[PDB]
Structure formats: C-alpha cells, structure tokens
Amino acid sequence: ADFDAVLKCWGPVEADYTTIGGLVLTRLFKEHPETQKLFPKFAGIAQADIAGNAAVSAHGATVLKKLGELLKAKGSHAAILKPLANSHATKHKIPINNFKLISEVLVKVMQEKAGLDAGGQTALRNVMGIIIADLEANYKELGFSG
Numbered sequence: 198a199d200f201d202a203v204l205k206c207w208g209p210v211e212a213d214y215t216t217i218g219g220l221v222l223t224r225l226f227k228e229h230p231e232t233q234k235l236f237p238k239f240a241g242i243a244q245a246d247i248a249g250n251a252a253v254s255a256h257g258a259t260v261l262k263k264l265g266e267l268l269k270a271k272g273s274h275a276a277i278l279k280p281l282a283n284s285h286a287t288k289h290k291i292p293i294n295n296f297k298l299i300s301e302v303l304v305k306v307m308q309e310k311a312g313l314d315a316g317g318q319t320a321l322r323n324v325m326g327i328i329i330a331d332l333e334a335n336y337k338e339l340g341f342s343g
C-alpha cells in the first residue's frame with residue numbers, strides 16, 4: 198500500500214529524473230557534507246558548483262530510477278534490493294546511516310517539488326524505512342554491523 202501511495206506523487210520525479218536527481222544529491226552534499234566524500238567522483242567539488250554539475254545530476258537520476266523501479270515492481274523486491282546492499286556494503290563502502298540521510302533529503306525535495314502532503318510523507322517514510330531495514334539486514338549477512 199505505501200509503495201502505491203508514493204506513486205501518487207511520483208509524476209514530477211519521473212518527469213525529470215535528472216533535474217530532481219540533481220536537487221537530491223546537491224541537497225545531500227550541502228546538508229551532510231561528509232556524504233560527498235563517499236562519492237570519490239564528486240568529492241572535493243565546491244558546494245556552489247554542485248547544482249549545475251551534469252555528472253552529479255546524472256547519478257541522481259540513477260538513484261531515483263532505482264527507487265522508481267522498486268515502487269513500480271510487481272515482482273520480488275528482494276531481487277532489486279539485495280544487489281543494492283551488496284554493492285553499497287562491499288564496493289562503495291557506505292555506512293547504513295547515510296541511507297537515512299538521503300531519505301530525509303528526498304522527503305524534503307518531494308515536499309517542495311512533488312506536492313508531497315502529510316499522508317504522502319508518511320507513506321514515503323514507511324517505504325524508505327522498509328528499504329533501509331532491508332539494506333541493513335543484507336549488510337549484516339555480509340558481515341557489516343558498523
């Protein structure tokens with residue numbers, strides 16, 4: 198139910214995954230500057246220079262497309278989220294709390310750009326909580342508990 202609820206507000210996101218993706222990552226790096234260093238391709242770019250950066254926006258589109266895939270899935274969520282945990286724990290080396298931070302940012306960007314109301318915020322927080330708990334479980338299976 199909460200996945201379908203978030204989709205009621207996803208139109209403006211999916212309309213421009215690149216622009217909205219850039220807003221998300223720009224705001225993540227501005228509000229949580231330690232996260233920028235977890236992206237070696239972006240680490241060191243002056244904050245004032247992130248909003249206009251096409252590579253940052255392209256990666257934000259990758260992120261939001263993956264969330265859209267999850268939301269729209271009729272099949273296994275596990276088939277989509279387990280690889281995501283595997284890569285983020287073992288390749289990218291991302292501490293789990295960062296996923297909470299990007300979720301906070303997404304809520305704000307959807308409030309501002311996608312008409313996310315109180316019920317929609319609930320739903321989105323619920324969906325992101327499901328995602329984060331699954332990532333954390335799969336991290337633990339790989340030996341990551343930090």
Ligand code: HEM
Nearest residue numbers: 232235236237259260263264281284285289291295296299
């Ligand atoms: C909504 C949560 C997130 C989603 C859906 C997501 C999705 C993705 C996807 C689909 C990729 C492409 C490669 C892969 O499959 O691993 C990726 C790569 C990556 N992600 Fe995430 N991610 C999320 C959160 C984060 C956070 C919070 C960080 C760091 C703070 C992070 C850091 C990275 C890095 C460093 C890469 C590799 C970029 C590259 O070298 O091109 N991700 N992510």
